[PDB]
Design a binder for this molecule. Structure first.
Ligand SMILES: Nc1nc2c(ncn2[C@@H]2O[C@H](COP(=O)(O)OP(=O)(O)O)[C@@H](O)[C@H]2O)c(=O)[nH]1
Ligand SMILES: [Ca+2]
Ligand SMILES: [Mg+2]
Lengths: 420, 69
């Protein structure tokens, strides 16, 4: 269980993915030219999980950049770490996806997808032992949502015994580009229920609110949102990227976090978020204001939780504080999964911080997120509003009815374990 | 799922082709009907004018027969 292949798709997917690579590159001591200039051996020990080695001690992200128009990837290529990516791993079309899941999944995306799979195959072929794949995308647009989920299906067909993990940005009317976002997200969620093992649910409303209410940013940009996402993705992948005992690979994480195959949608959180002691870190990481799915943890129960602490700190105190959280709020942890909170600690803290903590929760409260999308979907679908954009690509209404039913079923399955 | 993906795109193609075919046929029917209509309007007019020539001949003939008196 060594190599992970990363895919980033569409505008959101590429913009967040670029930031992710800048952040972990810095952490691993890799400069924009792919040269290592670090001072700790911890930096390189597991570097091969995310990077290939090239001639001259060069490290190259095992990353594939996908889009149906050139704009965002041109920007990535011009960005800070843009020259670090494999040039042959930029795979893009010209026509765009028009914020349309059907264009991403059935028409425009269908025309590009084989060339993406060719690059995926080339990367997979040079893996000693491929763990699986991580995809970054939004669910509200056309390419990341429609083409991203098409890719996931084809990857599963070709690599059915590998793990599929996604960082999936969920749309919100408060931070929205178009009105059809709920249609695109509903169509996508059904694909994710079936074809991913682990999905981190990142709600743009939560990101916005953290930026505005907590960080005191009067007018958050997508860039400000992406800074939070960056930091979170770094935190949640720490256990994959550095020496450790717990959740050290994608499958072991899945086995610890997913007690029923469809309930694999996680709420991530980060601390600190401020306009620091172990107790404070621990309280803030479990604080709903620090979580990124816009769901209230007190409205549900935790099936499983992974906590990851970073920095030099007392492991004794970490263990003490994590026990204190569970023992003092034991009702929010389902009693039929004993010892369902696992904690890891990594000595290397993220940039600019002496210590931090990252939270990954499998909570039945996540049903609130799917409920919100379901409501927004129905408000339009009851009048078949905006559907011509999809029927024009060959889809029929029955596919919308089925996706809506599938998502309502997911909501029902969470609620069942909330009352278990 | 792959079979469905193929069906969706061939459906999209079929509806676009059918839209083109229908537009092309409707326009052809309209231009033919219009041509026939305008031509018939012109023919009717010329027919009336030609009747007038007939009548004028009749008048001059009638004068000539009354001058044979
Ligand atoms: N957090 C974040 N969300 C984004 C960004 N760009 C677009 N979005 C969101 O992504 C969705 C639109 O999809 P987008 O990625 O732009 O479409 P695509 O290029 O067809 O995949 C909406 O919900 C937007 O709010 C970004 O840079 N960061
Ligand atoms: Ca085309
Ligand atoms: Mg966009």
């Amino acid at each position: 269980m060594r190599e992970i292949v990363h895919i980033q798709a569409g505008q959101c997917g590429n913009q967040i993915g670029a930031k992710f690579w800048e952040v972990i590159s810095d952490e691993h001591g890799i400069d924009p030219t792919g040269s290592y200039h670090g001072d700790s051996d911890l930096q390189l020990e597991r570097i091969n999980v995310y990077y290939n080695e090239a001639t001259g001690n060069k490290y190259v992200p095992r990353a594939i950049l996908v889009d149906l128009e050139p704009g965002t990837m041109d920007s990535v290529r011009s960005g800070p770490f843009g020259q670090i990516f494999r040039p042959d791993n930029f795979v893009f079309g010209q026509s765009g996806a028009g914020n349309n899941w059907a264009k991403g999944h059935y028409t425009e995306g269908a025309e590009l997808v084989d060339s993406v799979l060719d690059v995926v195959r080339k990367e997979s072929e040079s893996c000693d032992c491929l763990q699986g794949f991580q995809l970054t995308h939004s669910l509200g647009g056309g390419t990341g949502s429609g083409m991203g989920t098409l890719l996931i299906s084809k990857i599963r067909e070709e690599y059915p015994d590998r793990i599929m993990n996604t960082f999936s940005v969920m749309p919100s009317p408060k931070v929205s580009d178009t009105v059809v976002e709920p249609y695109n997200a509903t169509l996508s969620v059904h694909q994710l229920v079936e074809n991913t093992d682990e999905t981190y649910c990142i709600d743009n409303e939560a990101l916005y609110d953290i930026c505005f209410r907590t960080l005191k940013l009067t007018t958050p940009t997508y860039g400000d949102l992406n800074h939070l996402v960056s930091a979170t993705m770094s935190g949640v992948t720490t256990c994959l990227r550095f020496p450790g005992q717990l959740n050290a690979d994608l499958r072991k994480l899945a086995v610890n976090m997913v007690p029923f195959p469809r309930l694999h949608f996680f709420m991530p959180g980060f601390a600190p978020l401020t306009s620091l002691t172990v107790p404070e870190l621990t309280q803030q990481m479990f604080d709903s204001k620090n979580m990124m799915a816009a769901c209230d943890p007190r409205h549900g129960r935790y099936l499983t939780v992974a906590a990851i602490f970073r920095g030099r700190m007392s492991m004794k105190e970490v263990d003490e504080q994590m026990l204190n959280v569970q023992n003092k709020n034991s009702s929010y942890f389902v009693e039929w999964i004993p010892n369902n909170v696992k904690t890891a600690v990594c000595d290397i803290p993220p940039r600019g911080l002496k210590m931090s903590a990252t939270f990954i929760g499998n909570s039945t409260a996540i049903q609130e997120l799917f409920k919100r999308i379901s409501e927004q979907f129905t408000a339009m679908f009851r009048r078949k509003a905006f559907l011509h954009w999809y029927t024009g690509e060959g889809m029929d209404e029955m596919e919308f009815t089925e996706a809506e039913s599938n998502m309502n079923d997911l909501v029902s399955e969470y609620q069942q374990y909330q009352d278990a | 799922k792959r079979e469905h993906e193929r069906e969706v795109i061939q459906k999209a193609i079929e509806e676009n082709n059918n839209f083109i075919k229908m537009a092309k046929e409707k326009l052809a029917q309209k231009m033919e009907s219009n041509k026939e209509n305008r031509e018939a309007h012109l023919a009717a007019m010329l027919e009336r004018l030609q009747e007038k020539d007939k009548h004028a001949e009749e008048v001059r003939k009638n004068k000539e027969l009354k001058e044979e008196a």
